[model samples]
Target chain A: NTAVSAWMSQEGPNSDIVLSSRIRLARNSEEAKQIVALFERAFRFELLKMSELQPIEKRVLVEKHLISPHLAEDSPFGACLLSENEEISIMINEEDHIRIQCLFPGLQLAEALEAASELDDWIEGHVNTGLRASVMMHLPALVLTQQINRIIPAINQLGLVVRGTYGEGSEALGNIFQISNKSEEDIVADLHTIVEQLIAQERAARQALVKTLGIQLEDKVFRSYGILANCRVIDSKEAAQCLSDVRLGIDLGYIKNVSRNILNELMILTQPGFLQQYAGGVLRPEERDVRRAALIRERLRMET
Target chain B: GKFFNTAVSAWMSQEGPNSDIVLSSRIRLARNIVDFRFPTLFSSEEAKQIVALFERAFVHRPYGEAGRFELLKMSELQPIEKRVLVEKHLISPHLAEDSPFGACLLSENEEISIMINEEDHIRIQCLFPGLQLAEALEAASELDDWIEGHVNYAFDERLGYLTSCPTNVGTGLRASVMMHLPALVLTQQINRIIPAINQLGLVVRGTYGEGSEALGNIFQISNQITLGKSEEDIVADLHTIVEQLIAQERAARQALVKTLGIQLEDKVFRSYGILANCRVIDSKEAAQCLSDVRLGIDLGYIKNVSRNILNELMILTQPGFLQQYAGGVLRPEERDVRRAALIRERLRMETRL
Candidate 1:
């Protein structure tokens, strides 16, 4: 029987079967465990330190060395890897000198390694304007490389895929470079070209994603590379346009859907008007501050 | 078996022509089927006879000096004079210069009584051998048609009064039968078995028996009684059956508590303990005592007023206060206009300790 009909028979006509179905589906122990594992794995990435540099330290390094000095210290440049389960939160606290902490359920070492590597790659590309733009333009080409690398034995064992290829201009370049034969340096160069293609593709992808997710991402994308190149001379509108172009590529199936929403949100952050409007309406900054104080009081109450 | 102590108190505000000489009385049960109307006169020989009947019927026990019964004759007394007497006694005078009908209390021996305030109404209350709350209400309903005819005739032609309130226009009689809560709460696991009892269309309420507000530990279950039997037969049998059932339920609770090694005191039974063991006092004294306690508890004179009278007073004094003060406790249908006025008057005249 249809869920609605079945629920109506059991709990009367007013009962909603969709809610019941969702609750029932959520009760599967095996599925719940797998989701929890995925969450733990994602959480580990937030804690990984690359050569004495934590994700926060690495972020700071990219900020100081690669990004323009004019970028706001409190500017949102944080990266997060969340699993399907929604458990195990990893936060990089800027207040504590970029220290990463497990907010909840701890992550294992192997999971942490995978998270750290992915985050490192993401942050590295993000802090560098050319790399960020390159990766942004050709995400589909990179994703295809990543998928092929995953299926190949050696690449899969390495647990990391950093490769690249020419954009739509070079059909012959793709035939010459297979996933198994590519070196890290060769892959990195190809990945750079692929990033440029992804960025262009993202422009279209982002527009579609914005419509799907109800977000306006015209601003952040512009500021991202603009800040990286010259913080004081940043052209916010141009930055937003660049982000929109990248989104268009992603929306057109040239990039992964998983990252589309996040990229769109990042673009929105650059638009001060959108940010202020969101903060005033949905965020309610004053209420949030009051609630934060209340939460502190509650913690004391519970402890006492 | 001792007769059950039950009473129904009803009030009506009368206005219009020929309202001064309103007649009100209950039909005798034997003549109930024949639809006989007994018109009770105010301050006349007939009124005196009715008052005498009440005085003789009521066996007042000693309480205090204030407990003494003082009957005032309306004819000998002016409207203002009667008003003073009513104020002195903290009685809500249903019949005044403006009132079309008078007020009277009909007593059945010393146990059961019916207090009626006339605009044009007759409420009958009897102590059955053993009547359940539902059964008593059923009996009251069965006599509804007859009571209506009596009020109609007495008000329109006999007393020459016009404009019977909508509720009492056809019957001019609004009857509410009281039920003792001790049996339900103390004996029958009613407190614990509320869900099941509620399903039977019976509800447990406070001492005044209007809604689900808990009065200390007392609970009353009363509503219109329904049964596939004769009204009298059903009422009589129901009273007996309810009482017995209560007793049985009490015994079971006591046994269960004893087995649990907990000493259950009679006071712990709340409503049952108060009703069964407490001494009875005059209405005026009762009102005073309730008022004093209310003051001591930091509540105002509001507690001294009866549910019906309080509602009436609230309407007059603070028209919209009832809705605000009810706190979502009172049901929609339970709100009555005249009752509120009566309550307000009672509260205003209350002599504080």
Candidate 2:
């Protein structure tokens, strides 16, 4: 087969982009109505708001400023917020199972709702294993916050015109404001641009993370592809080339050294992961150390 | 000169028989005399007495090496000797089956005549000279049996007492036939002929034929026909057939040369002469000459004989050539402790190991 066909068969498919869009909407919703529509189209995940919008805004503002110090610490939390915002754009995008726990003063409305949305997205992404139970137990609090926030926004809008209490003014004004906001199409375009920027940022972040972790993702990907292709032909020259390429990759630090056991584990992990997403897994430390030992051993053997 | 030619040829035929007995007795006498007098010629009387005694006892046989038999007439002896004479210089005195000698002797109509020269050498002339041929042949057979028995006895007596030489001491007598393979291969493909020959119990082998040397285009078919035939008959037949084949090949080559108007020196047929003469020469010089004619020939004259023949021939003519020629020509060992230790030097030298 041609190199282009081989490369494309390994990498080409449009389904992952659709899944990523749903993930972005679930994480944040400046245009929740349009996002919910998208959610229905993609996964039919029945999107609904709580009873009102004012209290939800108040709760979200409180959680953003107060309940979690880590959220403001350049953790994934703000990224998630900006990731959800219809106007703000993030340049890094990833498929991740993110957990945000509010450890102070009981979980508030906005924090609970955001956590619930993230959990829902995680489950949809098949990331429901490790942190699922803990997130699920707090669902009721999350629903309560959703209802409270949904009702308060309407209450405030109504109250503003009636010359009533703070709650009544907010209910009155929030409804009027909500009614006059931009159209769903305009909102979606803005959201799409934001999501695209977030995706770019996530890619940069991942590359930096990979470098810090001492992985050569591109070279490793190339080598893995080469190894898989070479398995088809049994030519001596090709076999020798494959071996030499592998050695060069190791020498150039394009791939971490792999030991038999680490290789075995990687084989196990990558078999499923490759089938699912076409990504080869990381070589473990023990595996790398063993491979280093083996290289030395092979050199010694040749010497003798 | 006429007398000389007839006398020498007749002596060759008889001497072929009596030479064995003469050689054995001479060797024994020489050993005895060496203990007494370091080196001295036998007195004429002593020689005469020895001759007399041998004649009386070996009445039907010639007395010494001087009285031998030969197959060809003296005029033809040189070329035949050059082509067919054994290294030991012994000729079999067997008459052809239908030789007049066999019939005339059996009829007994005429007595064989003996001619004794001034030197006391004997030659046989007869009313039926062919009868003398038959008798000479019988004498040769008797002498061969005698020599064989004598050698076996001597070997048995000296068992474990003598160190063996390369030939004869262990396997005593080995007769071999040499073949020029290019003729055979050119005439007929080896694939078609070798299988049939193999089935007939003959082995086709590379040059330096059997005993482990590498010469490219010569082959030997040896000892394969002796199972049902006598050694002499087998040897004679091989010689006869090989001569016939070579003659045919020579004719073919000569015809080609004539047709092409090529000089004899320019023709490839010169190789047959060089091989048959068993000329030993420096391979590089030979290769240069051959390559002048054709650029690709690597082996030259001396390298084309069978290993056994090459070894024996070299010993007889050009000893130490193999050791001198082969030194430093072979690749070094793949791995040697010394070489491995001096890997840097080896790498520096760019040697393959």
Candidate 3:
């Protein structure tokens, strides 16, 4: 089996800029054990109890979008059901009893919502839900020009809000931001509309930046690209900053011989949680930093 | 250039006696050149010359026997770099601000750092990890003697070493211990302890010396009477006061263990769990949690994490060092997230048995 699941590997609408789309259905108590059993019987999914895995393992599930951070954290004694292909995830005993989540690469909220709704339909033979759709975007152009903040007010006017990658109130690390609803309606329809406008604004912003920023933009991108190719020791922040620039470079057609898919994989694989898991045990932060750099160098070189 | 590249300072890398209670010991001597006006009255050029004199002193004769001293011109350093120095206790916050002509001659281990032209013409300081007041003074005295041989210090027959501040006029020595008194603070004995210690001519301050808040229950306790006392007398007095503090702090810990043993254990383990697991947390919240975790380790309630690592995290999580490591500035909330992540990574355990 491939390391990544079907939804994560496949491309969707605006796949170049939109990282992924997710549909989360919120449900309400379990005999957590019985919930796990029901999920296995209904969806024929592989169930992993939060208590059964190490902290790092739980973190990997969070990164995979197969489980919510809240589910992995708040529900230690609870469990989650991952579909064979990992397109569907049912979080048992999170804030709710059964939270159905569906993930798809790039901007496919409609597909993800439909997939999650089918799971909800099956589970309703036994269960009961609120739906939220969010799109994770790589908005480097919008961020670089300080124009991202301006559109935020416009986004709010349409009943949507922008949050960082790690979720609410988190930093937009690697220039990746989330535009989701404060409350849903036309819901995914409204979110899709706002995102399309955002994408258009970002595209115009990138074009303007290429003319305005000129050599400075190239310098920022190339410097990071250079480090990604050469540096032996890189910490999380540096790696994140470098990844942001290089991703921007790829989008602008500045750097050649590397695909968005490879860069996206590097972003996920290079994180501290994933790095430690690859190392087979614990790594001191410094050791993990060295490992992170080594992995990036190896991966980027191979991509060429 | 080498000093900027090397991260750990002497006091941070090693441990000494009573380390559980005392984080580090420092000896700071306030001195002024014989003919120069105080730094407050100097023109930028005059201040420039003041720094130049110390630079020349180090250039001619290395301050230490092996001479690993590197001169860092304050004006040349970036603000974040200077902030790292202050957070590490290698330099004071006063020197970080408003010192265009300021420079510091730092020993390679950063055990000895002499500020050239701050509030005074020169401020010689020695910092050693844990309870090593006598050792700090001896090192500072050696550097002080070497500098005095090269440049004349302002002195009067009756007053001894003359300095910018009135209280620092005689011995000009401020011998202080950076103590972790979580037990005392937890027992609510620190409130009474501060007044009693003050009555005995020792002033207690927050970890960054005088002005900063005492995050993590860390305090800097130093002598208030530098004017009428001899250098040895002040150092010896501070040493005795610190020993008493260590004793009181341990007693407070034992009392807590006796009365609130289960609660203490729960708090300690809970704090450790948060630090080990949290993906996002603020420095303020992290500091309190780390204080509990440190107390837990010191008391044998927790065993995997080291005091050394805890001490390192105490400074590493500060805004300046956090940004320095990040290679850029972070929003306050962002910094908090990174701070928490850094803590989580640091507190990870070894390979399973």
* TM-score attained by chain A of model 2: 0.19
- lDDT for residue B101 in candidate 3, whole number 0-100: 81
Candidate 2: which docking quality band?
Answer: incorrect
Backbone clash tally for model 1?
64
- Candidate 1: which stretches are off by over 4 Å? A1-304, B1-102, B106-114, B118-120, B127-188, B191-205, B209-216, B223-229, B240-244, B265-353
Candidate 1: lDDT of B327?
A: 30
Model 2 Cα displacement at A109 (Å)? 99
lDDT, residue B237, candidate 1: 46
Best by DockQ: 3
Cα displacement (Å) at residue B320, model 2:
1.7
lDDT of 2 by residue, A1-304 (tens): 0111111122111211111111122222344344333434543122222222233332342222211223323223222222222211121112332332221111122333354445555545742221211100111111212443553355345321112111134432111111111432443343344334333443454445345533233333333323322121222222223333333233234535432122211221222122122212343443333333333223223322
Q: Order of all candidates by TM-score, from best down to worst?
A: 3, 1, 2
Better of 1 and 2 by lDDT: 1
Superposed Cα deviation of residue B335, candidate 3 (Å): 0.7
What candidate 2 gets wrong by more than 4 Å, as runs, is A1-304, B1-144, B148-174, B179-196, B205-209, B212-218, B254-353
Candidate 3, B46-144: lDDT as tens digits: 788877777776755554443567878888888988988888887888888867788888776667788887778888888787898888788888778
Return the TM-score for each candidate structure. 0.23, 0.21, 0.55
Q: Best TM-score goes to which candidate?
A: 3
